[PDB]
Write a protein that holds these residues in place. Sequence first.
Motif, short mmCIF file in Angstrom:
data_model
loop_
_atom_site.label_atom_id
_atom_site.label_comp_id
_atom_site.label_asym_id
_atom_site.label_seq_id
_atom_site.Cartn_x
_atom_site.Cartn_y
_atom_site.Cartn_z
N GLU C 42 45.19 32.30 33.96
CA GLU C 42 44.73 32.86 34.51
C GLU C 42 43.22 31.87 35.22
N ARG C 43 42.58 31.62 34.91
CA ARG C 43 41.75 30.70 34.80
C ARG C 43 41.30 30.00 34.56
N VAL C 44 41.03 28.96 34.30
CA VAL C 44 39.91 27.61 33.65
C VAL C 44 38.73 27.36 34.42
N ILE C 45 37.69 26.80 34.04
CA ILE C 45 36.16 27.07 33.79
C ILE C 45 35.69 25.67 33.21
N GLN C 46 36.31 24.25 34.25
CA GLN C 46 34.92 23.34 33.79
C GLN C 46 33.68 23.24 34.36
N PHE C 47 31.98 22.97 33.59
CA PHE C 47 30.96 23.10 33.88
C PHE C 47 31.17 22.14 33.10
N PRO C 74 40.78 42.31 26.81
CA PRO C 74 39.40 40.83 27.33
C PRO C 74 39.64 39.32 26.67
N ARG C 140 27.44 33.30 33.77
CA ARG C 140 28.50 34.24 34.66
C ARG C 140 29.59 34.37 34.63
N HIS C 141 30.28 33.73 33.90
CA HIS C 141 31.54 34.58 33.62
C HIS C 141 32.51 34.40 31.88
N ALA C 144 30.69 41.48 28.10
CA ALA C 144 31.65 42.35 26.76
C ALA C 144 32.73 42.49 26.95
N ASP C 145 33.21 42.78 28.97
CA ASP C 145 34.64 44.04 29.00
C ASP C 145 35.61 41.85 29.35
N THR C 146 34.76 41.11 29.47
CA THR C 146 35.03 39.71 29.81
C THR C 146 36.09 39.27 28.99
#
Lengths: 458, 458, 458, 458
Positions: C42-47, C74, C140-141, C144-146
């Motif tokens: 659903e979502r990949v984040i690389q930082f 979650p 930012r990502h 508690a609900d995410t």
Amino acid sequence: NLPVEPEFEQAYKELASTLENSTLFQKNPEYRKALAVVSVPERVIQFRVVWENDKGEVQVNRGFRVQFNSALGPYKGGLRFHPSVNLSILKFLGFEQIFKNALTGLNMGGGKGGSDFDPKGKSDSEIRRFCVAFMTELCRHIGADTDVPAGDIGVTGREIGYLFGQYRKLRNSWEGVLTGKGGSWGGSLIRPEATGYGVVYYVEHMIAHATNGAESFAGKRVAISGSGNVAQYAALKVIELGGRVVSLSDSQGSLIVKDTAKDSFTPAEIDAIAALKVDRKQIAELVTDAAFADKFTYLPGQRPWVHVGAVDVALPSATQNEVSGEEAQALIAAGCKFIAEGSNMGCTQAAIDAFEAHREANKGAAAIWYAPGKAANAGGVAVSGLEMAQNSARLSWTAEEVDARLKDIMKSCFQNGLDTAKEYATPADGILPSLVTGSNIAGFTKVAAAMKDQGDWW
Amino acid sequence: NLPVEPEFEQAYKELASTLENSTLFQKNPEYRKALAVVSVPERVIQFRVVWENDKGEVQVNRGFRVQFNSALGPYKGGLRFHPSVNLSILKFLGFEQIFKNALTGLNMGGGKGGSDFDPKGKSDSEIRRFCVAFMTELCRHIGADTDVPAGDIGVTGREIGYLFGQYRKLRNSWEGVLTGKGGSWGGSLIRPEATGYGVVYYVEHMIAHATNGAESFAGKRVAISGSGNVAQYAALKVIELGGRVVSLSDSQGSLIVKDTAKDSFTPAEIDAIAALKVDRKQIAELVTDAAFADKFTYLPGQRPWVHVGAVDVALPSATQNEVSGEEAQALIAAGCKFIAEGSNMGCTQAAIDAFEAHREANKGAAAIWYAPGKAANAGGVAVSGLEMAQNSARLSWTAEEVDARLKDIMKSCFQNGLDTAKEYATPADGILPSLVTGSNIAGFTKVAAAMKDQGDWW
Amino acid sequence: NLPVEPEFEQAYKELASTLENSTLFQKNPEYRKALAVVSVPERVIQFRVVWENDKGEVQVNRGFRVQFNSALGPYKGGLRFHPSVNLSILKFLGFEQIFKNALTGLNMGGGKGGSDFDPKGKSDSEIRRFCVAFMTELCRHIGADTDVPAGDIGVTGREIGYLFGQYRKLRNSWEGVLTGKGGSWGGSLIRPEATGYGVVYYVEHMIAHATNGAESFAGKRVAISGSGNVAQYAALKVIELGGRVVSLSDSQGSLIVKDTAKDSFTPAEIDAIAALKVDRKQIAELVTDAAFADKFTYLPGQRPWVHVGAVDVALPSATQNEVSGEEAQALIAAGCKFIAEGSNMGCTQAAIDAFEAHREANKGAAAIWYAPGKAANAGGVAVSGLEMAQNSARLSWTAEEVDARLKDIMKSCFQNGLDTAKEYATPADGILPSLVTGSNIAGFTKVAAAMKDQGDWW
Amino acid sequence: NLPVEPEFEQAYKELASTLENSTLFQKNPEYRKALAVVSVPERVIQFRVVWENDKGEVQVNRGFRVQFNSALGPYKGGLRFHPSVNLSILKFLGFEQIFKNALTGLNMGGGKGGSDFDPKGKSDSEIRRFCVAFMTELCRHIGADTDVPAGDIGVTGREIGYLFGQYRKLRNSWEGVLTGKGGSWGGSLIRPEATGYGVVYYVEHMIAHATNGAESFAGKRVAISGSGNVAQYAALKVIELGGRVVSLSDSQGSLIVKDTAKDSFTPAEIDAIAALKVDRKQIAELVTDAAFADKFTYLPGQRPWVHVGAVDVALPSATQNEVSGEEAQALIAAGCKFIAEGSNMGCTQAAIDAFEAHREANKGAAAIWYAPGKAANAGGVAVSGLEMAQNSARLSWTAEEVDARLKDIMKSCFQNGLDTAKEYATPADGILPSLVTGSNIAGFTKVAAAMKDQGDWW
């Protein structure tokens, strides 16, 4: 099961009939569907405002905020604090505002707020309390990019100040969310003038186009009806351009200048009219004074210019529906051929009917040209958008800069309306194109195109 | 200037009359002011929903969300998707829901949403599309702490799933914002059974209090008219407790056992009823069996209330009207002293008048005690609140825990109604307190007190 | 154009093959489409994480956060700080975690984070600095609900503390967003035990089904693989339940009792081995110690699976690939009938192949039931969800409360696996309904059903 | 463990080699560290886009958004909807965009988004659906101050409109978050003419500097190749300035007017070419027309440069590696000295080597100057930043205002590149500074300085 909304239903029916009568629909049949989408507001919010009066008693009112359309930009519309406000009236006002803002050519959406509050016979404390409550219940649905309320009937500078202060307390951000702020704390110049200069500029543009230059305003009985700020600044502007003002009477009576063909109102006279017209004092109190008795002939009770036999330009700003048949056919005979409704709904249907009949049956100076209130005034909205631009730029312009931008705005609006009238409402050579049809179609076509581009309908 | 809202106006008038016709305004005159503040919803949002049908054509519908009161807790409305919803109907439903939720005892507010969408004759794709559009326009107003919509007419598990998915996609937060979710993804147990079990527990409390335990909800001629799932759960619970189901009708013929005096239903019969009414099959399909026809005297195109004959405790789980004045007097003649009214509007207004008159004319033991639909059917809302509690606690309970909490909730409802009737309705010795008046005054007093405490009216 | 991801591609291929082989696609063909949608995260984040080492030099690392599925709850997952983490590895781990959490039964989704950071040979200051930078770029990502990260390889209690502190400093909200927090500041009990306890309960349920209420742990040659906390607490629990521990093996030889047939480990011995593991002394140093070598037979440079002797319960707790094909053959020859890996995510494929061949060989009651790692080690994730529930409930439970919930979770896992194995991968002979296939199908079916209900695929 | 990224690795290696070859590293050794930190993107987001096609049939695609650098301003980059898009390609494009925006001189950073979506052979409904899904998954990361996507390959005005509408629907704020919006709803002017006008200004400035104003574009032979909006508007601009268009090409055979030294392509001819390219037809498909048989000399297959005749400047906008080494020598012999890559990524490396060798071989009168594509492509990005400025200022400028700002931007970019080449590459007397090396060093130095100032590395 849809609730009855008389004013809104009438406005929608008029718009539909005007669109269907023209040749827009045959070239773009799909635009029919567009109509069905624009009628429904994007969002309507009603809230409850509970405040406290001067005797410590709880008072409950209803606030509204209709956000009709935002295809072309952020919602922008005034707040009306009147005892008659309901959802029908606000829907009607917002629906008209959409196409007005579309005609102005800036990026503003359509919308309208207000409440059942009755500011008349209220102390300043009561107005402060109600404003604070209203903004507390409203601040979560407005923003510099979402909603820009402004002033209207019932909302003066005082209410704007109170609302802005409460918004600042709540959102903790000093931003240009409301329109009509004071000059010290981020206001704008030429704001009081606004529509008064705008209508004059629009009339000048129309005269220059119709007569192919020649006389623009000089040596013309402009006859700025009404005694409001709108009429005052219109008279000042036409005086600067060289025109004469012959009928500057309010809704009450007929405070006509001495010579309807020779005498012209002076700037000092206009300032005096403003000074004794701002308060409850009327033109009766003016004619009681000797300065406005011999200089200004008094014919009270039967409209300003009905008894006037010498008129050249028409600005229906005195009363709503102040141009009936008799004066309608009198205007062409008297030499009044070019009209623009400075205010809204300031002339009867008969004026538009006579305009259409004579413009279709004649041409040139003979053809009586009348401008619609959707595109005629266009001054308040334009200056509101310029104030929004000033807020966004964090820089305050000068009076002349705002005046130049207003000039270009009204030129653009006139050009849009004229071109749209020419292309769709074909005049078949001569026959001054219908400004009503052109202005009603231009806004609709622009809004529908923007909505189709943004996937609001297909 | 206020629009006409028939249903809401009728509900408000009824509430005002009930408040005045008691010794509450005398003791607390200031509560008059409270009434006005509760009449105005805290917030009403109308939005436009634009979706696409199976033929790729743009469809525009109107969505509503009424957040009436939140003194006692977060708004906990339902969503009604029916081609009759407007602002009047939703206002009426929300206004009733306020006092219902107040009677339940958990912290829930009053509210109601929905749209003019007609789910009938729509493919699953169309329902998915509309749900996605609706939640896109609605997500900014709901929240786990702000608004918790549920199901109602038109909104089932399918729609709830679609709406939840879109909310999760937008807000990027898996929270408890809708009630009615599937068991796998954060649902609740006893969710279907809720209304039937709750009403059964409530009437059991009523009977136990009235007869001091001499008579129980078991071993009674329990009617349980209507063939909805609510009646299924009611019948199952009464059968388990030892009671006897005698008359399970529908909007069509009535499946009455031939020996309604002694013989009654079985769980297998209830399951067959459920199977038939799920598939739109009339229960005449159940009487088609020769043994069933002999053991059940069917009354085609008729409800038992017309020809009731002999029942001891009527439990109308049916819908609007049904029980009539003549049917009411037939019930009082038959000895229906302990009616339930499992669903709201199960009996007509004349029926309620007859019930009250016969209850007051009698002497308690023969008094016809009528349970009001506000207090009777509280299982659904209670279980919705319990599902919210499970979501908040991040731990799904078991069926027995939910059952115990439901028992507690219905006992609290009964206690509140009885005590408030005793204080204000002031029943005499050897009479049954008016449950309708008690349950009305309880809700109003609780809401008004909370609003006064929270500074909503002074 | 899709990049190569060896581990993820292998996992997806295995899942697809298992799905196709089982009799599910025949009954629900549409589920094929589900396989296409669940594969894409659903979502990949690389930082980018830029921190400062002890010498004041700038160091740059890459942090990842993969959120695969949130249909069931979650995005609870773990953080891995190892100098091998890339997008492929984290993708594989997240994909497995989806179905693991689905089998667990609580509402958690699938996900995995971490970084290329190498905690080995780093001062506490360096770990603090990197954690602060990582949480600054990550907060930012998560929510508690995410997203709920937890610990894994590289992320111990220290890192969890640092990350929690920085999150609190940024978001200004003391909430439960990370799992593995210390007991003082909102931690949980039984967390060190967790999986080591959990698998035990699992296998007992397995026993309760295999023998139908017969020989329990007491009299079972349970084969602990290393004194890791998993096998440590597993051995403690089985010793309490009467089970005999007959092995232990760190990275070197095998720690087996002298009389492995009769004599077994004891809690004192277990904690001694634990203390030696803390000081990295391992089993070799214990053999150097006189008393242990007298009471324990040493087999240097050899896993217990090579010299199991006679065993009936086995568990490769150390890591993956502890048991080989030949080792599995030795185990079954030894009489091992209840191999169940509470660790060892994947194993040598030959071992699982041998287990499946023997389970389909129809050995009757004396058949080797092999439990998959996905269902056996669900205890850790279960306790993580219980810690989340404690955080949400604002209350800290007691040890026995958490133990009871763990038992319920393991029972639910086992029941789900058995039922799903019986439904689709039905065994012609009731011997050992293929726990691997059962757990695979259970996870996939549950996730696919939830996604279809939520409109993620149609 | 780092994944292979061919294009990005090649670009990084080229940049590193260029940096090392110059003397920038010797003066600022610490800048080496910067090279590491800029290599890692600040953030990469991959999401899943699920949409339905014209026949249901759920389709799953992968969307990307790379935010490389924001030292100098908000992220700004295009969206590419092509079947070949993956993380490597987008990473490469974003890395180049960083230094392009740095050379431009406005405050924008480097970034790039898009998806594997194939817009070819898709209905408008399919594009609308995919755009709506994509923006729904993307709006959480973009913003007027965070990310400004624009158009690129695959994203025309249609997609921009759809994305903007969905963004408004999700976040009810009409702001400037995408670039490429239509003129009615907050667009810009000189948008199609961005690239061609900009490259013409750049080459004019370079010519004026090189020849000290000896020769301007008046009476100058210009080889406008690569049929497209860039070429059309470049030809129009040079014609206005007095340049003579001598050659032209496309995906098919070269156009070449009759006299490649005296005849010039008329604006009507350019409009005909535009009509040809719009309808996907070519010059070879219009040779049979009168306008082509009498005023054009179609050249099958052979490149325009092989038959330039008399020319001195060129812009290879047709295809990659259009000019060869032998063709470069032919151009030098014909008198070509002032080439500049209008919109091409890179010509034949041998051609660039020949140009660089000739830069030092002889004086600028004989040295053939080549401008890098990144320096000459600043028109598009510049106009995108001007559109952002117009959105921010809430006012729409005129075409001449945008033209003036473009001239200033190109002057600034050329000056920056020239000064950086002069000070670092330090060419001797009578040697033309390397524009490619100068532009590379300028971008890197500016970005590294800004990052050091902001504490991104030390």
